RNA sequence: AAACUUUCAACAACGGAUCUCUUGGUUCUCGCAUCGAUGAAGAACGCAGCGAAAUGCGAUACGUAAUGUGAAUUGCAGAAUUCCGUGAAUCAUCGAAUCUUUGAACGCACAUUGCGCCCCUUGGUAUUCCAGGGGGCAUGCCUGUUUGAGCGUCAU
RNA sequence: CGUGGAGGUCAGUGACGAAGCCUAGACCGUAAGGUCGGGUCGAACGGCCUCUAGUGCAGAUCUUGGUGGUAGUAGCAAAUAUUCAAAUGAGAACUUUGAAGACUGAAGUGGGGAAAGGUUCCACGUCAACAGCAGUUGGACGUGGGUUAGUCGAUCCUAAGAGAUGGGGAAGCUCCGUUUCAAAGGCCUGAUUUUAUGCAGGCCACCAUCGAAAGGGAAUCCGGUUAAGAUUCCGGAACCUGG
RNA sequence: AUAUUGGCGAGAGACCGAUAGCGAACAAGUACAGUGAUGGAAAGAUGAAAAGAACUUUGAAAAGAGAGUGAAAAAGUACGUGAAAUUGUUGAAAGGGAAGGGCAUUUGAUCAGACA
């Protein structure tokens, strides 16, 4: 149970601060866990998502289908993954939205200020 | 001497003149439904002329 | 209406008493407010009583 | 609110029309003008004798009555046929008083306190309190009263070194000192008997 | 009549747009707006028009400056540049 | 009238700009419930008071 | 507007609201290095000011309309 | 698409010569817009115009403000715009003025600190 | 005997009740004190690559600069490595800027986007006439500078 | 007996379908009402011991909302009146073209305005709604086009009047009054460029400002021209004012 | 120490759950009426994701019927559940100037105990 009067355990005050979050706070809401390879390779349980990762779906009807993060859509709170494709009736394809809690990252798209993001969280290089 | 029409800008940004007809028909149907339900109410409370005459005395 | 064998009681409620009542819901808010002003006045003046 | 339905200036049309006598929103134009107001029965009016903020929220009890009820509940704790009939699983508990040693007051880790409760016999009671997590019924569940558990055993120390820090987290288990023995904690929901685990520093303080 | 044949003569306006409040309320035959008296100094404020105070009270419109004083107190009314 | 001022012609420009349907790609937005345009008017029915 | 161009030598601009028939005649004299003998402005009802500037005979309007690039 | 971090360093006449190029390029991009559906490139011309015009303005502002360093009445713009109350109230000195009775008394018998213990 | 009327059930309509939901409202408690002539609140008009509103904003116009986060916005259209970076973003932070015509309204007005004044420059041969630009011109009162008025009154 | 919430308990029930809803299907209770089976349905909900209340509807010319019978009924009848052929069209008593027939009959069913309206003006496309029948047509619907002034008006004057200032009333929002009981202003010359003036040097003693798109008022006509614009644009020919 | 139905920032509720709660959960003091002072509404719910129906056929077209999406079109923008008044269809039945109701029973429909 909480022990402060700064944070609120109210349902309306929590869901409002979720649904009207800014587009720089939705980044840390959309996070994903790492693999058994990546967790023992870095030392981080979960990172904020970033486009052009390589990901795997562990819950849902597309379980096992790996892919590449095509465009993280933090307005519909989701992320369209390549090779996660619904054939529309018109012969075209649409990418199917996944929520990033139900993903798992396997091959990461590193960068500076991600090699700092790991090391502030206590990982390796 | 135009290379710009009405339709030239709107064929690029979103809508298409076949789907525009499938949008224009939906507004005029929803304008009917919002003008029906106002006449479903105002006809009851409109005869209340607060300064009537009742023009028959003698 | 003077109905029964009851005590003749006077209630001073002719006025607009509803706009001026103060139901003290503060009674346990401005006690822990006071027990912090007896701590800021215990820390600001540091060894004095 | 004090103007909950009185932000509308209406006045009746007397008698001489074919409509009711209630204050009607005069004027014209929009769909409103012609409705009723100011009544308990009009749509969009005040309620009947509206609920005011000066009720009797808190109520007095004679202090000796409160010390009577607490001393009654403490005595009702120590009968086997009350705490079992209250709803606590006190079946395979060897002694109804259930005094433990005073080394419970120095425990600090919840892993090292839950085993200390399972040893003295709350193993079929913590399971009772965490297999019983159900959802609240009706409109309360969106007023921060969403879940509903049962109540568990109440361990009572005499001077704490993190026993309350240990058992704050586990569901159902409550802590208390012997001063401030709560009637709300001791007969929860007006039913007597509560599976109270005394430590011996408390059980010799209770004298 | 006094009804329909006397509703046809209504053409010449007696109110025009006000320059302070912007609604069709500036009387012309004596030059005084009725939603806020324009050649007078203070706006027409009233306590019996308690709903009318909400139609023109503060917090209604844009507040091009008064929605920054709340933020600008919280940083001590500080000056100078941000940082490096 | 035809001998209008400029205060009226300043307003009739906005009155001619605010007389069109809602743009059709607004309804294709994500959290958009705006079905028709409600403040739309024409000169037959609701006279603007100026 | 492009029928008025080839008839005379009459450029048709949409100008600012605060122009006063002299800043028009001084900036259209400047930005094109042309010479202007008549300017008639009106307020087109979109809140716009449309100026029927007539370039002096010594200049074609089609040469300026092809130099600008709006033909 | 001009950047302020390299636009600060230039001279004044180069910045005027940059603004009188962007004001031509906006005119040409608005000529081309009549015979084309869409042009997203015009926004990076308007923001470049504003990025030059901010740098010119806050260069000249600093050129005046450094000229008025320490002079007794610097102008109404370059004063620190606090509220209306905070300027019409007293300073920290004119509040901390005390007369020579209160000052001599407040250095003669000021507050002492102590405790209550035998 | 059908039609018809009435009763009922299933199926379909009209109709939006009930059930369940909730980024809203109400009431209570706690902390802090900050509008405006450096031009406020309020208002008119205008601004997006494609908006009529809500929101934001001022001819630098759904915004500029600084700082922080470090790879988007998304309805479509576009730049795409600017992606191991002086750097994406309808982001957050906000300390520097513009801030249209107004408004206590401040040159005189106002049912007018009316009409002068003074200075500094620019062109038209140009102290005077015209035009473009830049900054000025209100009243009441306080302190001081300057210039005066009064057989009010003093010295020569 | 029941309803909305609150404290316990049933380690209650539930996506293998919780509430709700329907059933001349069943059972229990004299009843208040409870329980089951079926169809629909898709996320919560009861029992018992207690606590609390914005708690039980047929009515109040009840409030809001919905729908009946009356009923395919009353009717859709002033302004003389329509007809034929063809054309696009899915379709024509109703649109257009022609041909007839008429009417308004110059205090017009004509040609222009003022108030007021505000884009209806005009072209292209179109008929879900509106045009109390119809509809391809329209003052409707969608998107674009259009108003050009040295002279015609406002701007500039003054009327009836409105209204600051000097003041004087008024606790005061503000009230009186408009030249009064104000020390109320502006400019040629010796000075003539130190245009500052020393006097020269004085001239009514005046006076904010608003108030007419029909009063007063400086000057423009013709001929073309546009889908829509004119004494405005084009061509030619005139003027008035300031310099 | 005291007050605070305003502004700003918070924290909670034995309160209400869209005819309630502020007039406003929604482009609300907006749409709208009045010359004006002021008066002032209605209006939330597809689905997990639009995967919003490709294609064929009749029709001038609105749409229909297949086919397809869907866990569900008994979820197709008029979109959760879909009550009643009211209405169509088919079925059952009855009817000499009302219909309804009470007690008993014939006939017709349906339900039943197991006494397996
Ligand atoms: Zn006003």
Q: For residue D13, what is the nearest residue in chain B, using CA coordinates?
A: B50
Candidates A100, A111, A122, A106; CA nearest to A29 is A100
Both tokens of residue D207? 């004298």
d(CA F6, CA A23): 45
d(CA A98, CA A62): 10
Chain B residues with beta carbon closer than 8 angstroms to that of H37? 4, 8-9, 11-13
Q: Does residue A82 contact residue A102 with C-beta atoms inside 8 Å? A: no
Q: Does residue G67 contact residue G19 with C-beta atoms inside 8 Å? A: no
Chain H residues with beta carbon closer than 8 angstroms to that of C47? 113-115
Secondary structure of chain D as H, E, C letters = CCCCCCCCCCCCCCCCCCCCCCCECCCCCCCCCCCECCCCCCCCCCCCCCCCCCCCCCCCCCHHHHHHHHHHHHHHHCCHHHHHHHCCCCCCCCCCCCCECHHHHHCCCCHHHHHHHHHHCCHHHHHHHHCCCEECCHHHHHCCCCEECCCCCEEECCCCCCHHHHHCCCCCCEEECCCCCCHHHHCCCCCCCCCEEEEHHHHCCCC
Chain H residues with beta carbon closer than 8 angstroms to that of C44? none
Which chains border E (3 or more CB–CB pairs < 8 Å)? Answer: F, H
Question: 């713009």: which residue's tokens?
Answer: H77
Q: Is the dihedral of CA D132, D135, D139, D143 positive or negative?
A: positive
The minimum CA-CA distance between H40 and chain B, rounded to whole Å, is 12
Candidates A15, A13, A30; CA nearest to A75 is A30
Candidates D115, D189, D109; CA nearest to D149 is D189
Q: Does residue G47 contact residue G28 with C-beta atoms inside 8 Å? A: no
The minimum CA-CA distance between H100 and chain E, rounded to whole Å, is 34
Candidates D174, D185, D178; CA nearest to D200 is D178
Of B42, B48, B50, nearest to D31 by CB-CB distance is B42
Q: Does residue G45 contact residue G39 with C-beta atoms inside 8 Å? A: no
The minimum CA-CA distance between H69 and chain C, rounded to whole Å, is 40
Using DSSP bridges, classify how beta strands E15-17 and E24-27 pair: parallel, antiparallel or unpaired.
antiparallel
The alpha carbon of E20 and the centre of ligand 1 are apart by a number of angstroms equal to: 5
Both tokens of residue D120? 């003295």
The minimum CA-CA distance between C17 and chain D, rounded to whole Å, is 12
How far CA C7 is from CA of A1, C14, D204, in Å, comes to 55, 19, 55
Chain A residues with beta carbon closer than 8 angstroms to that of D169? 1
Both tokens of residue A117? 């993001």
Q: Does residue D195 contact residue D154 with C-beta atoms inside 8 Å? A: yes
Chain B residues with beta carbon closer than 8 angstroms to that of D31? 38, 41-42, 45
Using DSSP bridges, classify how beta strands A54-57 and A103-107 pair: parallel, antiparallel or unpaired.
antiparallel
- Nearest nt by C1' to E8 Cα: J116
A14 CA to K21 C1' distance (Å): 21
Q: Does residue D25 contact residue D35 with C-beta atoms inside 8 Å? A: yes
d(CA B35, CA C28): 56
User: What long-range pairs does D39-43 form, CB within 8 A, spacing at least 24?
Assistant: none
Candidates D145, D133, D162, D154; CA nearest to D197 is D154
**Chain J positions under 7 Å from a protein CB?**
4-14, 44-46, 49-50, 53-55, 60-67, 113-120, 128-129, 139-150, 153, 162-163, 173-174, 213, 232-235
d(CA F44, CA D179): 81
8 Å CB contact of G70 and H28: no
Q: Does residue F22 contact residue F36 with C-beta atoms inside 8 Å? A: yes
E73 among annotated binding-site residues: no
d(CA D181, CA D196): 11
Residue of E16, E19, E20, E25 to mutate, interface with F, max F Cβ within 10 Å: E16
d(CA F4, CA E11): 15
Q: Which residues of H80-110 are buried (b: 16+ CB within 10 A; e: fewer)?
A: eeeeeeeeeeeeeeeeeeeeeeeeeeeeeee
d(CA E20, CA D165): 65
d(CA B50, CA D25): 12
- Nearest nt by C1' to D37 Cα: J63
Q: Does residue B23 contact residue F34 with C-beta atoms inside 8 Å? A: no
Structural domains in chain A plus CATH codes: 1-125 (2.30.30.30)
Structural domains in chain H plus CATH codes: 1-72 (no CATH), 73-118 (6.10.250.3450)
DSSP state of H93: S
Beta bridge partners of D156: D176, D198
8 Å CB contact of B15 and F22: no
Q: Is the minimum CB–CB distance between H115 and chain C shorter than 8 Å?
A: yes
Candidates D22, D2, D5; CA nearest to D14 is D22
Q: Is the minimum CB–CB distance between B13 and chain H shorter than 8 Å?
A: yes
Q: Is the dihedral of CA D159, D162, D166, D171 positive or negative?
A: positive
The alpha carbon of E44 and the centre of ligand 1 are apart by a number of angstroms equal to: 9
Q: For residue C20, what is the nearest residue in chain D, using CA coordinates?
A: D54
Experiment type: cryo-EM
The minimum CA-CA distance between B12 and chain H, rounded to whole Å, is 8
Candidates A52, A42, A47; CA nearest to A100 is A47
Using DSSP bridges, classify how beta strands D154-156 and D174-176 pair: parallel, antiparallel or unpaired.
parallel
Q: Does residue D165 contact residue D121 with C-beta atoms inside 8 Å? A: no
How far CA E65 is from CA of E59, E61, E70, in Å, comes to 11, 11, 10
User: What long-range pairs does F26-34 form, CB within 8 A, spacing at least 24?
Assistant: F27/B23, F28/B14, F28/B15, F30/A75, F30/A76
Q: Does residue D168 contact residue D108 with C-beta atoms inside 8 Å? A: no
Residue of H83, H85, H86 to mutate, interface with E, max E Cβ within 10 Å: H83
Q: Do chains B and D touch (3 or more CB pairs under 8 A)?
A: yes
3-state secondary structure of H81: coil
Beta bridge partners of D147: D135
Burial of residue D117, with CB atoms counted within 10 A of its CB: 0-12 exposed, 13-18 middle, 19 or more buried: buried
Chain H residues with beta carbon closer than 8 angstroms to that of B12? 37-38
DSSP state of G21: S
d(CA A118, CA A43): 8
Both tokens of residue C31? 């006690």
Q: Do chains C and G touch (3 or more CB pairs under 8 A)?
A: no
d(CA D178, CA H33): 84
| Ion ligand 1: residue ranges with CB closer than 5 A | E 18, 20-21, 33, 35-36
Q: Is the dihedral of CA D45, D49, D51, D54 positive or negative?
A: positive
Q: Which phi and psi (to 5°) does residue A53 adopt?
A: -80, 180
d(CA D158, CA D174): 14
Q: Is the minimum CB–CB distance between C21 and chain D shorter than 8 Å?
A: yes
8 Å CB contact of A9 and D144: yes
Using DSSP bridges, classify how beta strands D196-198 and D154-156 pair: parallel, antiparallel or unpaired.
parallel
d(CA B39, CA B33): 10
Question: Which H or E run includes G48?
Answer: strand G48-55
Directed axis angle between helix H43-65 and helix H13-31, to 10°?
Answer: 160
Directed axis angle between helix D111-120 and helix D123-130, to 10°?
Answer: 120
Q: Do chains G and H touch (3 or more CB pairs under 8 A)?
A: yes
Candidates H19, H17, H16; CA nearest to H27 is H19
E18 among annotated binding-site residues: yes
Q: Which phi and psi (to 5°) does residue A114 adopt?
A: -130, -30
8 Å CB contact of G68 and H31: yes
Give the distance from CA A123 to its chain's centroid: 19
Neighbours of D112 (CB within 10 A): 10
d(CA H18, CA H10): 10
């Amino acid at each position: 149970a909480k022990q402060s009067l700064d944070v609120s355990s109210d349902r309306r005050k929590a869901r409002k601060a979720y649904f009207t979050a800014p587009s720089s706070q939705r980044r840390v809401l959309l996070s994903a866990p790492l693999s058994k390879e990546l967790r023992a390779q870095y030392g981080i349980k979960a990172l904020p998502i970033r486009r052009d990762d390589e990901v795997l779906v562990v819950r849902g009807s597309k379980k096992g289908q790996e892919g590449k993060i095509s465009s993280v859509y933090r307005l519909k709170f989701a992320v369209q993954v390549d090779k996660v494709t619904k054939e529309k009736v018109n012969g075209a394809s649409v990418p199917i939205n996944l929520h990033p809690s139900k993903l798992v990252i396997t091959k990461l798209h590193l960068d500076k200020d991600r090699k700092a993001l790991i090391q502030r969280k206590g990982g390796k290089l | 001497r135009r290379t710009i029409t009405a339709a030239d800008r709107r064929m690029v940004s979103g809508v298409t003149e076949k789907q525009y007809k499938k949008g224009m028909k939906k507004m005029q149907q929803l304008e009917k439904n919002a003008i029906n339900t106002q006449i479903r109410r105002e006809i009851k409370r409109v005869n209340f002329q607060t300064h009537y005459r009742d023009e028959l005395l003698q | 209406a003077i109905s029964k064998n009851l005590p003749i009681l006077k209630n001073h409620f002719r006025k607009h008493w509803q706009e001026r009542v103060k139901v003290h819901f503060d009674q346990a808010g401005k006690k822990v407010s006071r027990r912090n002003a007896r701590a800021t006045r215990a820390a600001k003046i540091a060894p004095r009583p | 609110s004090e103007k909950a339905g009185h932000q509308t200036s209406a006045e009746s049309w007397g008698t001489g029309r074919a409509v009711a006598r209630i204050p009607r929103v005069g004027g014209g134009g929009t769909g409103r003008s012609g409705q009723g107001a100011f009544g308990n029965m009009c749509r969009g009016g005040r309620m009947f004798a509206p609920t005011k903020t000066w009720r009797k929220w808190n109520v007095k009890v004679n202090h000796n009555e409160k010390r009577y009820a607490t001393a009654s509940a403490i005595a009702a704790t120590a009968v086997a046929s009350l705490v079992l009939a209250r709803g606590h699983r006190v079946e395979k508990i060897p002694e109804i008083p259930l005094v433990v040693s005073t080394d419970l007051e120095s425990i600090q880790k919840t892993k090292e306190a839950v085993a200390a409760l399972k040893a003295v016999g709350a193993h079929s009671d913590l399971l009772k309190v965490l297999k019983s997590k159900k959802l609240r019924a009706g409109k309360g569940k969106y007023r921060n009263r969403r879940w509903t558990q049962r109540r568990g055993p109440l361990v009572v120390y005499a001077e704490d070194n993190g026993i309350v820090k240990a058992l704050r987290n586990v569901p159902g288990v409550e802590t208390a000192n012997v001063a401030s023995l709560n009637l709300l904690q001791l007969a929860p929901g007006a039913h007597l008997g509560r599976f109270v685990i005394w430590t011996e520093a408390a059980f010799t303080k209770l004298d | 009549g006094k009804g329909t044949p006397s509703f046809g003569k209504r053409h010449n306006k007696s109110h025009t747009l006000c320059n302070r409040c912007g609604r069709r309320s500036f009387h012309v035959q004596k030059k005084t707006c009725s939603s806020c008296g324009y050649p007078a100094a203070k706006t027409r404020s009233y306590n019996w028009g308690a709903k009318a105070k909400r139609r023109h009270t503060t917090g209604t419109g844009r507040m091009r400056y008064l929605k920054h004083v709340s933020r600008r107190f919280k940083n001590g009314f500080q000056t100078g540049s941000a940082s490096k | 009238a035809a001998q209008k001022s400029f205060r009226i012609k300043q307003k009739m420009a906005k009155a001619k700009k605010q007389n069109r349907p809602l743009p059709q790609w607004i309804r294709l937005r994500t959290n958009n419930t705006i079905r028709y345009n409600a403040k739309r008017r024409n000169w037959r029915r609701t006279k603007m008071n100026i | 507007a492009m029928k008025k161009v080839e008839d005379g030598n009459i450029l048709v601009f949409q100008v600012s609201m605060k122009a006063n028939k002299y800043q028009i005649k001084k900036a259209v004299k400047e930005l094109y290095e042309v010479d202007v003998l008549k300017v008639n402005t009106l307020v087109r009802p979109n809140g716009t000011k449309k100026a029927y500037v007539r370039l002096t005979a010594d200049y074609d309007a089609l040469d300026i309309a092809n130099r600008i690039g709006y033909i | 698409g001009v950047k302020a971090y390299e636009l600060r360093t230039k001279s004044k006449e180069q910045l005027a010569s940059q603004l009188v190029d962007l004001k031509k390029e906006l005119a040409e991009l608005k000529v081309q817009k009549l015979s084309r559906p869409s042009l997203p490139k015009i926004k990076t011309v308007r923001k470049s115009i504003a990025c030059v015009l901010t740098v010119i303005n806050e260069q000249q502002r600093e050129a005046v403000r450094q000229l008025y360093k320490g002079k007794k009445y610097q102008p109404k713009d370059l004063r620190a715009k606090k509220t209306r109350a905070l300027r019409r109230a007293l300073t920290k000195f004119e509040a901390s003025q005390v007369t020579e009775k209160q000052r001599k008394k407040q250095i003669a018998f000021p507050q002492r600190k102590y405790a209550i213990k035998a």
